[PDB]
Amino acid sequence: LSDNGIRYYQTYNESLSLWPVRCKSFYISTRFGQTHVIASGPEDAPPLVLLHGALFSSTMWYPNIADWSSKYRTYAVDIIGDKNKSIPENVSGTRTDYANWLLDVFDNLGIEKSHMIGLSLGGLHTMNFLLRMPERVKSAAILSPAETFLPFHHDFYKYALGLTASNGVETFLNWMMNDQNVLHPIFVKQFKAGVMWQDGSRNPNPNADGFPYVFTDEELRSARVPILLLLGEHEVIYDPHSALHRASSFVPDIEAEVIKNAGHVLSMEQPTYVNERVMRFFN
Amino acid sequence: IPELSDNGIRYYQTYNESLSLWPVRCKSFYISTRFGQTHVIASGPEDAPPLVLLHGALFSSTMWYPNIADWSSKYRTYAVDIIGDKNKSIPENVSGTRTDYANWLLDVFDNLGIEKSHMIGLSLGGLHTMNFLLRMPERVKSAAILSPAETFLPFHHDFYKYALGLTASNGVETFLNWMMNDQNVLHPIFVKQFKAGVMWQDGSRNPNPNADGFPYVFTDEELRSARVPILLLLGEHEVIYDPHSALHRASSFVPDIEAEVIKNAGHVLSMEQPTYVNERVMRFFNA
């Protein structure tokens, strides 16, 4: 770990101070590297897996974990290769690799079947997984997924490219959060330290067979596990209504909605609503 | 306008070393504008007709080292650092609008005392060139547009995917290996500067993204409004978009355009095939 990486790890730990319940941080071994997991909830309760949005880490679930972990043994898994505490190894970058990584996580956590919640990148990993390992998923809540139904609008790339510039994180977040005062300052400090940390592990080369990815009509038609799709009305990475329409056109028996007064990071903007909505779906 | 950071100092060091590649006498100076202090490198005979060069994104005016001996033998050549891009120009309150970028270049022309000038732009500089010539035709003689950023077609998403990786371990070699077809064409000193600029992240702010700014694709009617002679050169191995589709579109709409896809070249064609590119553009401007 470099000095920027040490500093990022520090900010991550401070961000856990926001976690309103007791949790345990630990590493699990996989074929693609040591994977960080935060576990919460009763040991004997049914399992729930959380996969975070890009660059945000597992720490982002602080406004949701008190409600979700009351009933489920919840595992917030740091996505291998993204900006967080997981340490990737031998990742070619294919959708198959990422699916196998998560399978190793389920396997090492003792999970047979589980409920899943993914936001942004985690939403894309969730769709990928349920399509490949359907017998391991009870049902899945996909929230503002990265691509999946529609390609990224070029605005996303324009703002993302300016992240690593003076005032780039503020600019990026203001665009994504619709200029709303939502994120706790401590978490923002972590997000920024992640952005500053650029000498860590290498990214896999861009790959048509990796992520981000838009599923074909026939791939969407093949979904076999129940899905809840939540999008925000103020989503900026693609048009939310168009995404819902494409999802509804092909994913059989989907439950889906565009949430008023929320955008992309809807789990942090409208936790009370989102917390109950997802729980209602899992029941 | 922050004091120059340690990474900024390192970038300035690399910019200076890269200027050692310039095979002709030059001068570095600044032009004061409503929009900031614009860095310019001037070369060629002082009374010769003017030529303005506009570099591609993140590369700076130092990128013209393989072309300047030929071009400045004939023209008083001004290599202008695009205001707000990663280079020696110091931006102040740049809105980032297409109108304001044209007004910025007009002030540069006015300060340099230019009436009409030939212009050469590559990538981002090509997009500034098309924008400027459509708005201010009376200030342009003819224009060479080389591998322009968007302009005719939108960027293929891979551009963005590779660009986003620039600030990662091995991000620059990955980006360059992709854009340059795994070839070793850039001078190591120039690459050291390109990398130093990528690492210099605490300088100026960027204008906020804006549909009324760059990058941009001109409409059919906009393309049809062109009223100066234009040369479009594209590379057979272009990666930011399909060069043949871009050529077809340009030819269909820009009146009297001269356009060709160059062999054994990709995006940064001026550094990949300088001998050919140098004569071709001079031929175009000469008669």
Ligand SMILES: [Cl-]
């Ligand atoms: Cl209900």
Ligand SMILES: [Mg+2]
């Ligand atoms: Mg001629």
